[PDB]
Amino acid sequence: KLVRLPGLIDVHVHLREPGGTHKEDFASGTAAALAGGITMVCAMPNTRPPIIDGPALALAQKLAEAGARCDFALFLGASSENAGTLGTVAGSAAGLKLYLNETTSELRLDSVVQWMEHFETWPSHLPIVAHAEQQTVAAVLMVAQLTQRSVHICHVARKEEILLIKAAKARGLPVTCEVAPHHLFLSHDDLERLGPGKGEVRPELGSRQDVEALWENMAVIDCFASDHAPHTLEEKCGSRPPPGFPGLETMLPLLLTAVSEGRLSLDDLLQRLHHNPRRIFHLPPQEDTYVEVDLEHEWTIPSHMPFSKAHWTPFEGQKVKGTVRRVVLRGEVAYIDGQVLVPPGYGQDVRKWPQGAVPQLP
Ligand SMILES: O=C1C[C@@H](C(=O)O)NC(=O)N1
Ligand SMILES: [Zn+2]
Ligand SMILES: [Zn+2]
Ligand SMILES: [Zn+2]
Ligand SMILES: [Zn+2]
Q1: Which residues are within 8 A (CB) of 34 and not within 5 positions of it... i.e. 6 or more apart?
Q2: Which class does domain 1-362 fall in?
Q3: Rg of the chain over CA atoms, in angstroms?
């Protein structure tokens, strides 16, 4: 007997188009999403060109409309030049992304004052998410309080970070967060197997104590999100390995394994991959959309999953229980047992749906 799940949402993916399409493109990345039981993705802005201005957003929107197989929203990225310039297009984006740690010259912010300027100028009803590690979590929380608004913390990876967020929630502060599967299912213990190139990711893999703290503090985690960050094996294994792991095709099987072991409940999973993504980002329902999973099927993750152009995975060799059998997206069969059955361009920008605009005061 299969279990019917709603259409799951991944609020943190890197689909590499424009400009990095040997790593992934909208068509391959959304195939990966569908095969992972994900029917809606929010794509990050660190493409080439980066999505830091209205022309780049317009290009990315058209590339996504033409290539995506599942539905999507596109983030804008904060830069050192664009605060106060995004007001006309802000509501068309998933939200604003701040890269507050090591990043590219185009997305780099050199001063906390620039963070403040973004918090002050970005429309106050629209989402802001941050790559903010270690003390940066506390720093961006301070900026959010100074500017009297919410913030969402991407890929929480450390005991330190989850406990800081827990303390902030205990004080009633408007902060939410997400955790990626590699920070729940991999640790320093895996670095020997992965090697130093494949093992490169930001935030880095944590200690066993970090992993245990995330599980212990599941109540603090609002969302799961993959941080799908595909790079080719040649890049990961070469002289200057870029950080990141592909993860769309493995996230749900890993989490279903944990459900089957009683580490979290089915409801806990659906809050974190469906209801909380919807409510934090004001993402609309998808009509006639669902995912059928087989919870009994035991398998071992292979050296690469079928769809991502990354063509490698750090979870190779892990034994999992649970698999996606069928996905229906807006009344059409999108995926069955290893075959994607909707073409590039079937997917739509959810921010253009009437129900997909973020409500605001006039
Ligand atoms: O912050 C980031 C971005 C990402 C990428 O490759 O785009 N990969 C990572 O590991 N961390
Ligand atoms: Zn990040
Ligand atoms: Zn994120
Ligand atoms: Zn990311
Ligand atoms: Zn529900």
Answers
A1: 69, 70, 327, 329, 334, 335, 340, 342
A2: alpha beta
A3: 19
132 within 8 A of 155, measured Cβ to Cβ: no
In this structure, are residues 181 and 296 in contact, taking their beta carbons and an 8 Å threshold? no
Q: How far apart are CA 152 and CA 163, in angstroms?
A: 15
Minimum-distance ligand 1 atom for the alpha carbon of 201: 10
- Does 178 belong to an annotated binding site? yes
Q: How many CB atoms lie within 10 A of CB 266?
A: 15
Experimental method: X-ray
The amino acid sitting at 196 is P
Q: Is 227 a catalytic residue?
A: yes
Ligand 5 centroid distance, CA of 121 (Å): 34
* Whole-angstrom distance, CA of residue 334 vs CA of residue 81: 40
List the catalytic residue out of 10, 222, 227, 349: 227
Cβ–ligand 1 distance for 201 under 6 Å, the answer: yes
Residues, beta carbon < 5 Å, ion ligand 2: 131
Give 352 Cα–ligand 4 centroid separation in angstroms. Answer: 24
Cα 250 to Cα 82, 253, 283, distances in angstroms = 35, 6, 23
Domain boundaries, the chain: 1-362
* Cβ 83 vs Cβ 112: under 8 Å: no
Overall resolution, Å:
1.1
